A paper describes a structure:
Voltage-activated potassium (Kv) channels open in response to membrane depolarization to conduct K+ ions, a process that is critical for electrical signaling in neurons and endocrine cells, as well as muscle contraction. Kv channels contain voltage-sensing domains that activate with membrane depolarization, and a central pore domain that opens to conduct K+ ions with high selectivity. The X-ray crystal structure of [name].2, a mammalian homolog of the Shaker Kv channel, and those of the [name].2–2.1 chimera containing the S3b-S4 paddle motif from Kv2.1 (Kv chimera), serve as a structural framework for understanding the gating mechanism of Kv channels. Since no structure has been obtained for a voltage-activated ion channel in a membrane environment, in the present study we solved the structure of the Kv chimera reconstituted in a lipid nanodisc environment using single-particle cryo-electron microscopy (cryo-EM).
To obtain maps with a higher local resolution, we performed particle subtraction, followed by additional classifications as well as 3D refinement on the cytosolic and transmembrane domain independently. We built three models for the Kv chimera: one for the cytosolic domain, another for the transmembrane domain, and a third hybrid model that combines the two models which fits in the overall 3.3 Å resolution map of the entire complex. For the higher resolution cytosolic domains, cryo-EM densities for most of the side chains were clearly visible, we could resolve density from the NADP+ cofactor bound to the β subunit and densities for bound water molecules in areas where local resolution was better than 2.8 Å. We do see a slight shift/rotation of the cytosolic region of the α subunit and β subunit with respect to the transmembrane domain of the α subunit when compared to the crystal structure, with the most pronounced changes in the β subunit, likely reflecting the lack of contacts between molecules that are present in the crystal of the Kv chimera.
Author numbering:
A (entry chain G), B (entry chain A), C (entry chain C), D (entry chain E): 37 to 361
E (entry chain B), F (entry chain D), G (entry chain H), H (entry chain F): 31 to 132
Write the structure that this text describes.
Amino acid sequence: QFYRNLGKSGLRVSCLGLGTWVTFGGQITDEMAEHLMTLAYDNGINLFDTAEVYAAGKAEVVLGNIIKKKGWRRSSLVITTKIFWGGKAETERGLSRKHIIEGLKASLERLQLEYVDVVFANRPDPNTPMEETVRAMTHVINQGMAMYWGTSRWSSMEIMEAYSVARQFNLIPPICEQAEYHMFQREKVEVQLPELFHKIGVGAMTWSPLACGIVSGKYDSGIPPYSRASLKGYQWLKDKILSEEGRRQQAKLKELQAIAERLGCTLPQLAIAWCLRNEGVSSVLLGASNAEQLMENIGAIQVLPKLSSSIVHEIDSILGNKPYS
Amino acid sequence: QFYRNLGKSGLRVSCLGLGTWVTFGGQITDEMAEHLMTLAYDNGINLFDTAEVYAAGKAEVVLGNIIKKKGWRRSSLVITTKIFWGGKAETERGLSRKHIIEGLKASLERLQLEYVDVVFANRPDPNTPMEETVRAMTHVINQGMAMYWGTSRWSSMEIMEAYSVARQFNLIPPICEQAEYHMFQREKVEVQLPELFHKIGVGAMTWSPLACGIVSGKYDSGIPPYSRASLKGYQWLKDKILSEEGRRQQAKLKELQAIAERLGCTLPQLAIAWCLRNEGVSSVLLGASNAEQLMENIGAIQVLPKLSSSIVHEIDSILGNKPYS
Amino acid sequence: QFYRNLGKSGLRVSCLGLGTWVTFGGQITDEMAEHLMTLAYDNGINLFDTAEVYAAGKAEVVLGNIIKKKGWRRSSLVITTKIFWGGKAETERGLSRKHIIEGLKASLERLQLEYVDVVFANRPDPNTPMEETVRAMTHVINQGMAMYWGTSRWSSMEIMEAYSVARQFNLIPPICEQAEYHMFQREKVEVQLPELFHKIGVGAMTWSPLACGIVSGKYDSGIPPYSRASLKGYQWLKDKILSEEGRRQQAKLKELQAIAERLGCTLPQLAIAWCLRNEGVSSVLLGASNAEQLMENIGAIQVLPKLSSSIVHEIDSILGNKPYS
Amino acid sequence: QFYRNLGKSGLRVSCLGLGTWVTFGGQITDEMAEHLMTLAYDNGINLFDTAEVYAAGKAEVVLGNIIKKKGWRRSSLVITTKIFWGGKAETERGLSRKHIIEGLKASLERLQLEYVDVVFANRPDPNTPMEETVRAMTHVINQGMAMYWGTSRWSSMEIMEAYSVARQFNLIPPICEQAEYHMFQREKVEVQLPELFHKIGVGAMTWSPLACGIVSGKYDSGIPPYSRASLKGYQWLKDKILSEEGRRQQAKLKELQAIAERLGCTLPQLAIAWCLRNEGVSSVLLGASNAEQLMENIGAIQVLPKLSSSIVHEIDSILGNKPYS
Amino acid sequence: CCERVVINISGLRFETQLKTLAQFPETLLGDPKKRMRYFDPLRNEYFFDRNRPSFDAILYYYQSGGRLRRPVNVPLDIFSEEIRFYELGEEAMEMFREDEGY
Amino acid sequence: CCERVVINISGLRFETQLKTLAQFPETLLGDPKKRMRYFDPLRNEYFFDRNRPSFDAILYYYQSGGRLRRPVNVPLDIFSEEIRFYELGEEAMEMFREDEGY
Amino acid sequence: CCERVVINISGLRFETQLKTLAQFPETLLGDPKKRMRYFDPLRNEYFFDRNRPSFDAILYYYQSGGRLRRPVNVPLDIFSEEIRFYELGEEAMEMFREDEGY
Amino acid sequence: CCERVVINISGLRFETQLKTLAQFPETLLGDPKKRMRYFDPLRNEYFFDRNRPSFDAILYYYQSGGRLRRPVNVPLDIFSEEIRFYELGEEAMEMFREDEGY
Ligand SMILES: NC(=O)c1ccc[n+]([C@@H]2O[C@H](COP(=O)([O-])OP(=O)(O)OC[C@H]3O[C@@H](n4cnc5c(N)ncnc54)[C@H](OP(=O)(O)O)[C@@H]3O)[C@@H](O)[C@H]2O)c1
Ligand SMILES: NC(=O)c1ccc[n+]([C@@H]2O[C@H](COP(=O)([O-])OP(=O)(O)OC[C@H]3O[C@@H](n4cnc5c(N)ncnc54)[C@H](OP(=O)(O)O)[C@@H]3O)[C@@H](O)[C@H]2O)c1
Ligand SMILES: NC(=O)c1ccc[n+]([C@@H]2O[C@H](COP(=O)([O-])OP(=O)(O)OC[C@H]3O[C@@H](n4cnc5c(N)ncnc54)[C@H](OP(=O)(O)O)[C@@H]3O)[C@@H](O)[C@H]2O)c1
Ligand SMILES: NC(=O)c1ccc[n+]([C@@H]2O[C@H](COP(=O)([O-])OP(=O)(O)OC[C@H]3O[C@@H](n4cnc5c(N)ncnc54)[C@H](OP(=O)(O)O)[C@@H]3O)[C@@H](O)[C@H]2O)c1
């Protein structure tokens, strides 16, 4: 089934989501951004993830004009946002009660929405009590600015601490968790996350399934022009690909070319259906810069019946990084 | 006593209610719909039940234009709605926090009401925690969109589970229960619902007292034209009447013609006053397609003093389906 | 001191209040109603009690137009309302969640106010759970329609039941109690009320200090014209004065003429300062039909230092109705 | 670091704040008030403290017109207000539920703000229960009128009583405390406040670091013209300086001239960096009447690395008032 | 099955699963019609204003499946009047007295 | 009658109906004027900062109707100073010592 | 460490730090995979519908670090079937019987 | 005085007035600087993950004013290591052993 619950919650999301990081409001134009969402919404995707830090808030503006113009029912979409960085002032960062209420009210005027569905705490805040965060997240849900809330990049101890404050004070616990999960990042979603799911009912909405485009295999001959590694201010991704740990990963991706050739799929379709192979991962946030990439990545749903137990055993011998509990 | 409480709650409803299933917005016109509510409101009926699934939302529009046209006080009416189905999208079904808040806000714009008296979960949702449903039902009561909430077709374990979450988290428990109760459906309201009434204080608002028109006796000579069994998309009711279990029921209704002849009543008036014969049933949702049927069914209150203990014993020997505890 | 707290609460009310029953919107004109409130507000009275049942809602309209015309600050006034009767419909009576929320919202449009201070439950409701009343009274306080709530004519067991529900469910307990207290009605405010005040912190705001004008002594020569006993629909007050239990009370009031002659006071000033002689009574709701009566009754504060212990012993020998604990 | 948390809370305030007492709306003009806030906001100060009692409410009007004129983001400012005195009426004073909700709603229309950050109870109220204050402070936070709340001049037993009620009833505890702290007032912030900070997490936002201008040393030759001691209605400050206990303090300030000469600083810069020398004090509310004083006092952050342990030992031998635990 | 019944014995809470009490259908805690009159709906619990140390042996009768024994601090006159209230039968009373020796 | 009174003995909570304590009107828990000074209004309970194991025998004095006995772990000097506080009388003290043998 | 685990034994609540139970990783309360099936997520606690006076000796086994002993009011047949449930080992069972003399 | 301090001993809650614990200023519960490290801010209580039946005799030491005695179910090795934690002194330890006979 293509639609699946988000944690134990009643929120039904699609198994592939679309993210507005880098591309929307940055890399690609507003007209291509209108075309990618129409291609995604007509394929059954209802999950559209953005943040206030993306493109200094311009990524929510592009998403906001697409939902107004298209005239898509708000009931059929699941819009999620992330609140940690609001700007340059010291009171415009963190998960304080001031910034969660202001930063979500500021994002709802750029998105031109009455509410988002899941507001995410984009990273943990060591300078804030967990009572203040859980009371402020409960506040914007009871005011009707959000339906659910989740956490992004939080240690499973921080998620279990936020859960125990919500039961103590009769607040609302988080439903979700965004964690990085691709073939080269497996420790949190295969070991830490599964324990949380069966205990308290927190699902994972994993982001970057292609590791910012590395696992697509396009970087094997160096840095191609007009890809994300050649964009301005992304030297950290060029230093990641060209380093000796990043040159070793491309030697593994050529070994994955043979497994993707045995199936009908490609290597981006393999690397996404590998992320959906378990019941713990509730969704996958794609990234797409044009219509050929998004049509390719939505073709990874039909590759998910093709993965048997034996191909999962075969890929993990090539990767060589399976975590131990 | 024509007006009776709804459960243990302070909400005083009439013993007969008017339903908008099939007729309103579907079968009969807007002008007849205006005439049936004026006939019902002038006979003391204040209970008007609708849903968002009825006529793809057009049944709430017809009801909404009558209250504005007649200029009825909102204080004198008890308007109830049901929120389970909203449309084709996967996020537009269920009892999630997203759909209870959206679907009730969408129904309050078709009804053109500030708020509704009782909001009803139209069926149980296995893909949602009971905490999420009870928190979302409490939310729309504290925002002022509803006063009370009830459940429809929920087993008595699901009602007792929803009650124990509301006491755990200091939420609002349901006051009501809609269950099908006629002469051919007796198991829930005579066995399961009475136990719940004395324990936690949940009343029953029973629907279909004539079993979609079967117990009126009109189907004894086949399928009459312009009745509900001949409408488009109601083959399930024609398959129910013409089947061999449904042909046996018409042989019992001819035996009930003699009991209705001993009293002054008819068979629809007998079949409604039989549903009101106990203190557990708090109301009965009628259905009427014209003004002769509604004037006939409101005449069933007079038959309620005529039912002695002996006629109740006489009907149950004809029916032959009395449940055992 | 002229201003005193209302129970243990922080609400500072004056020791004399003005009531809109009968005189406002009924007996006297709108121009005299404007003159009595200017005379009361310039003497330090901030307590102005009304209800929705008074004059079929016309008494709140008169009060509402005076606050807008005089331009009084809402901060300097304490406006209280009572919400038990709304009209002829069965859903327009009682202390249900529908009528408290619905009723208060109707009174705030006649008073033209954004909030009242204390909403009173005008009488107890046997057909409503106490949970539903305390949750609905808490609801209109958290929405900002009221600041406090109190009860009128509730048995001290009903007040202690409403207190124990508010501590159970973390709701808001009542602060006040309106009870009839004059020289001929002493049982509740001298025995039952004092116990409540020291235990849970509920004060008394006593009404009818002159027993609808009887203790003023004007009815000793029969029924004078243009007094309240000669008004339309007040035969219950004429039957109370002319009966043999009511003729005996006038024989006691002639004996109180000598005690009021020993002081400088009159008999209405004596009968009000007798009600303020204890610390349990937090306020007294006057009634005045013209400017000579209101100027006379505000002169009862000066008589309150004149009452020693010995005059209190002397009046109680004339009354002969002191309650026993 | 210049920005520091307020208690344990997530609210990041600057170590120097600007207060609108006397200088704003009173002593200095609106044009100088616009110039002092631009000088403060460009030096990193985000804390701007006002009250409703200051200048009969005119001090909030001046502050309110500057934020609208300069076009400052509300997110970058921390606006705090104090609610105890609203006016002449008996219901316009105290920490009752009526005055906290009215007085903050009245201050938000003079400040022209949608919310303040920290509302302060300006002094304790003996005629109000602590439940009523903590429920009313929680109410204006959940309505969105304030983010945090604190207390001013509340003993540490009253702060610990307030904290206990908030855990009992699942309310919101205060985050802050304004206490007077200069070289001649040390008992509360060095003994009582530190205990509170490690136990429950309440920080101090200390006001009057120069003791209304005394510790600046300007009053050593009598009363200079156009200083605060020569203003109308400030005879209590002239009686404080010219008295024999106040003449002795000026003999200590001449001994502090030598210590301020050993450093590069002046005596106002010494007296402020002495207040910031501990981790318990979360902020210091300055007062400035012109641009030379404010530029001088913001230069006290540079003197804070210059204070070693030995200079702190040297000043306390000159002061001779170190409290004992 | 998973439903838990909270039984309050004079202020002492005793939460138990419903399928534990329903193991013995003829007792006061096993028959829902008998224990209906002790239900506190505002607290969602069964309130018994009865002896407090007697009920831990009455509760472990249902959990162990029929192994009751008198607590050491509860006398024989007090504890035998508790078995008659909780209606543990004429059959489990005779197994009680033989262990007792009465 | 129906009303239940929560009595808190140093953090241990005992809940009993009001018509149980009102069976004995001259004791500290039976007279509402005497127990008025121990009421905690923010918690809706009577707080006694007293001995904890003594009160289960004091509570069962009211429930059984006059049958009090000393608990096995509470000494005679501790428990006799609790009967004098809870004011169970000069009459139920003499029935206590004879059982005791004092 | 700091995290506290609430363990509910038939309505009796015991709260202990997580680094106390994690001192013994092979028992039922020390292994998070074993005690996962007893977690009540709506109450944030571990619910065991088991014997009530046995668990105070089981809890003090973890706090003292391996010093368990039978309570005086809990018999040997009841308490030995609790050590087998809480899985305190074949090693701490032999130290139990020698103290016992069995 | 009026202020009540909730002390939580491994899930068992004891509530006492502050002027009871402040009667003995050199113990762990009497000195506010010593018991500061055991305060749970979220629950407004002092949490001690210690022995549970020992503390009722430690609590009644403060209420009676210096009369402590060992509970009957708490051994001498367990209870003597609790008097050293709660810091009841070298003086009230000698009065304990003489009653004990040690
Ligand atoms: N902390 C957080 O919560 C967090 C952080 C980061 C991202 N996210 C979410 O996850 C999403 C981003 O995932 P991601 O974009 O970083 O990794 P992907 O793995 O999602 O990155 C996709 C990008 O790589 C390239 N690519 C994708 N498919 C391709 C194909 N079939 N062939 C060739 N190239 C292909 C694309 O073009 P180019 O190579 O030209 O760019 C595209 O822009 C965002 O939308 C965001 O919402 C969340
Ligand atoms: N899940 C739920 O909560 C749920 C589900 C269904 C319904 N409901 C409520 O209950 C109501 C419907 O009850 P119902 O309509 O299904 O059963 P009824 O038993 O309420 O059905 C009445 C229909 O049967 C026929 N009828 C009624 N009285 C008659 C008479 N005296 N003589 C001859 N024919 C007569 C009518 O004409 P025709 O035979 O020509 O049609 C009428 O349309 C709805 O309005 C709805 O609000 C709730
Ligand atoms: N259930 C409730 O909560 C409740 C019920 C009733 C009233 N109340 C409150 O209490 C107030 C009414 O008190 P009340 O009016 O019933 O008894 P009073 O004892 O308050 O009645 C005063 C009325 O008696 C006559 N009177 C007053 N002073 C007089 C004087 N010095 N000399 C001669 N006549 C004098 C007046 O003229 P006339 O004789 O010409 O009329 C006046 O209309 C109302 O405003 C209402 O708000 C509350
Ligand atoms: N209860 C409370 O919570 C409370 C009470 C009072 C104040 N506060 C807060 O604290 C602030 C006031 O602190 P404060 O004004 O009372 O004491 P300061 O110690 O803050 O007083 C500064 C005033 O003294 C003089 N001064 C300051 N620096 C000087 C310098 N370098 N050289 C010469 N003179 C200098 C100034 O000119 P002049 O000498 O000409 O006046 C100025 O008006 C207010 O803004 C208020 O928000 C709070």
